Design a protein around this ligand. Structure first.
Ligand SMILES: NC(=O)c1ncn([C@@H]2O[C@H](COP(=O)(O)O)[C@@H](O)[C@H]2O)c1/N=C/N[C@@H]1O[C@H](COP(=O)(O)O)[C@@H](O)[C@H]1O
Ligand SMILES: [Cl-]
Ligand code: NA
Length: 265
């Protein structure tokens, strides 16, 4: 709870593009293998990107949710507005991963492509690193408590894998990923608070930077990210931000992000 001169928890914004529009939803209600929608807008994804660039927020992510091809064009708008500022995910694979780097993304975020038959596919994973480099790959290990563990979920969170999120998995995938992104899908988009157990896990055993996402609702929940995460876990807020129809002031969340860069001088 008291500040840290060494560590600084980053706010990592998001842009959730579904069927061509910017939305925030309860992602666990997507059934495309109607989702509960928290917010829709016709504002171009490029305007959210420009806002983040203005406030110096780096390492946020654009998600192309679903197969609709108009989501691809809206994502390139945001990446073109904020070159190098955004990670981009949503159906990244071997054949298109490099293309997203060449459109201004700093990273691609991957889950489903590196999973086959419920297992981590080592050869697919090595193909990403070969093409884009580990430094431009983010692995998303979003998960859901199942039989006492955190099972990783694939295919837009509509399939349980057979890999559980634990220390041994993170030590291994860290040889292939610059960073980890982890949604607590049970609580995601539902504006009810966060998963403290998952954040505590991510902060104890992740050897590379890890962003938690899901259910951040009030400013006090940002202080739990610090507390449970031992100042090791970055945090995403989506459905609660006032710019996505919530009650949480985006400007307050930015101020909190800058308050974490504590300088003695
Ligand atoms: N059903 C889904 O919604 C879904 N499924 C997968 N993704 C992401 O897409 C990316 C690519 O996955 P693959 O296509 O490679 O499997 C990965 O990062 C996935 O986690 C999904 N979308 C996540 N959306 C994010 O949920 C967060 C909101 O938080 P909140 O404060 O609580 O409102 C923000 O990060 C939103 O952009
Ligand atoms: Cl699979
Ligand atoms: Na959401």
């Amino acid at each position: 709870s008291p500040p840290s001169i060494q560590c600084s928890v980053q706010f990592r914004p998001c842009i959730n593009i579904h069927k061509g529009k910017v939305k925030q939803i309860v992602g666990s209600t997507l059934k495309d293998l109607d989702p509960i929608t928290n917010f829709e807008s016709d504002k171009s994804a490029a305007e959210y990107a420009t806002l983040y660039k203005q406030d110096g927020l780096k390492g946020g992510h654009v998600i192309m949710l679903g197969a609709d091809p108009f989501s691809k064009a809206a994502s390139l708008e945001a990446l073109h507005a904020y070159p190098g500022g955004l990670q981009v995910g949503g159906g990244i694979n071997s054949d298109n991963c490099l293309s997203y780097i060449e459109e201004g993304a700093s990273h691609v975020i991957v889950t489903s492509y590196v999973f086959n038959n419920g297992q981590m596919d080592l050869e697919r994973l090595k193909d990403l690193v070969r093409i884009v480099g580990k430094e431009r790959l983010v692995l998303d290990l979003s998960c859901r408590k199942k039989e006492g563990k955190y099972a990783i979920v694939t295919d837009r969170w509509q399939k349980f894998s057979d890999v559980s999120l634990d220390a041994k998995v993170m030590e291994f995938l860290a040889n292939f990923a610059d960073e980890f992104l982890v949604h607590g899908v049970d609580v995601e988009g539902k504006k009810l608070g966060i998963d403290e157990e998952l954040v505590a896990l991510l902060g104890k055993h992740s050897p590379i930077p890890v962003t938690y996402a899901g259910g951040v609702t009030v400013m006090d929940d940002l202080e739990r990210i610090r507390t449970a995460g031992m100042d090791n876990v970055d945090v995403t807020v989506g459905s609660a931000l006032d710019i996505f129809g919530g009650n949480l002031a985006y400007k307050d969340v930015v101020a909190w992000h800058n308050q974490q860069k504590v300088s003695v001088a």
